[PDB]
Ligand binder design. Structure first.
Ligand SMILES: Nc1nc2c(ncn2[C@@H]2O[C@@H]3COP(=O)(O)O[C@H]4[C@@H](O)[C@H](n5cnc6c(=O)[nH]c(N)nc65)O[C@@H]4COP(=O)(O)O[C@H]3[C@H]2O)c(=O)[nH]1
Length: 285
């Protein structure tokens, strides 16, 4: 919950930015402070990364007494060519690139000093998880110029991040599809579902191959316990809105669930969305 809350905090600071300033310049202190907190950093800088994957040497923000940035330092070059966190384990100790879901490297965290007892894989993993999610947000919410649905774009980018979270870090997420089969209750059920949206959850309102309303809900960074806690909350909400006498199911709601796993193979998510939920590739990528 700490990660989710840290990310929601950042996201809100992004939403309230004037839109005059670049997110990365104006929120640099906050981004670095966030990373410092999770890595127990002591000496570090945050740097803009250019188009061509080179770093701008003048830092956006520093922590402690960070020395000048060795542009062609081995750790820095390796990090930026590989697009992944690299460390010196076994001047700089760790470099963490901030890479979005499309592989654009937006920024670079360069770590001079962190306590040795946290200089390990557990810590490197939190740093890499946080960096990727910050990256997405820095290019995110103020990004609606493409003539596709804003909602549709944010849904698929969040889904792509949760897939990386699963694949790379074993982090769990859950997708629900609510298929609404009764036209009498359809709109009112979907409105109830829309109003329940919480935290980093994202939603997409769709119509399937049989013309029925389908509400997709993605629960980022949420375990199997938790997913069940969500459906439990949701059932209480349906009981207030409609009969406590009645169940979700008696309103024409069919629930489909897909758990994102490190185990879940390649085209498993694809089979879930299409030829199962009956959606297509123009609704989610
Ligand atoms: N992804 C996702 N998961 C969900 C959702 N609803 C419930 N869960 C899961 O169900 C657990 C219990 O939820 P609760 O009864 O609402 O009990 C919650 C609730 O009373 C409170 N809480 C947590 N987040 C919020 C929030 O964003 N707004 C409000 N008003 N209360 C919250 O803290 C208790 C424990 O919350 P958690 O530790 O998060 O633990 C949550 C969470 O793991 C949802 O819309 N999306």
């Amino acid at each position: 919950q700490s990660l989710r809350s840290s990310l929601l905090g950042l996201r809100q600071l992004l939403r309230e930015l004037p839109g005059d300033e670049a997110p990365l310049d104006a929120l640099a202190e906050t981004v670095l402070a966030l990373l410092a907190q999770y890595g127990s950093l002591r000496i570090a800088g945050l740097y803009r990364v250019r188009y061509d994957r080179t770093p701008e040497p003048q830092p956006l923000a520093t922590l402690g007494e960070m020395p000048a940035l060795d542009a062609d330092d081995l750790l820095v070059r390796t990090c930026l060519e590989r697009g992944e966190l690299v460390s010196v384990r076994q001047a700089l100790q760790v470099c963490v690139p901030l890479v979005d879901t499309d592989g654009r490297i937006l920024a670079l965290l360069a770590v001079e000093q962190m306590p040795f007892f946290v200089f390990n894989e557990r810590t490197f993993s939190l740093l890499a998880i946080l960096a990727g999610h910050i990256a997405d947000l820095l290019q995110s919410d103020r990004r609606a110029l493409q003539l596709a649905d804003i909602d549709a774009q944010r849904f698929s980018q969040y889904l792509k991040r949760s897939l990386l979270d699963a694949r790379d870090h074993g982090l769990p997420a859950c997708l629900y599809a609510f298929e609404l089969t009764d036209a009498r209750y359809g709109e009112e059920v979907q409105r109830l579902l829309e109003g329940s949206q919480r935290g980093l959850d994202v939603q997409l309102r769709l119509r399937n191959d049989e013309g029925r309303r389908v509400l997709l809900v993605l629960l980022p960074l949420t375990s199997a316990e938790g997913s069940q806690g969500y459906l439990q909350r949701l059932r209480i909400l349906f009981a207030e809105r409609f009969g406590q006498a009645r169940e979700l199911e008696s309103l024409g709601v069919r629930i489909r669930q897909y758990e994102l796993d490190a185990g879940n193979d390649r085209q498993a998510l694809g089979h879930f969305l299409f030829n199962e939920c009956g959606l297509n590739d123009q609704q989610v990528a």
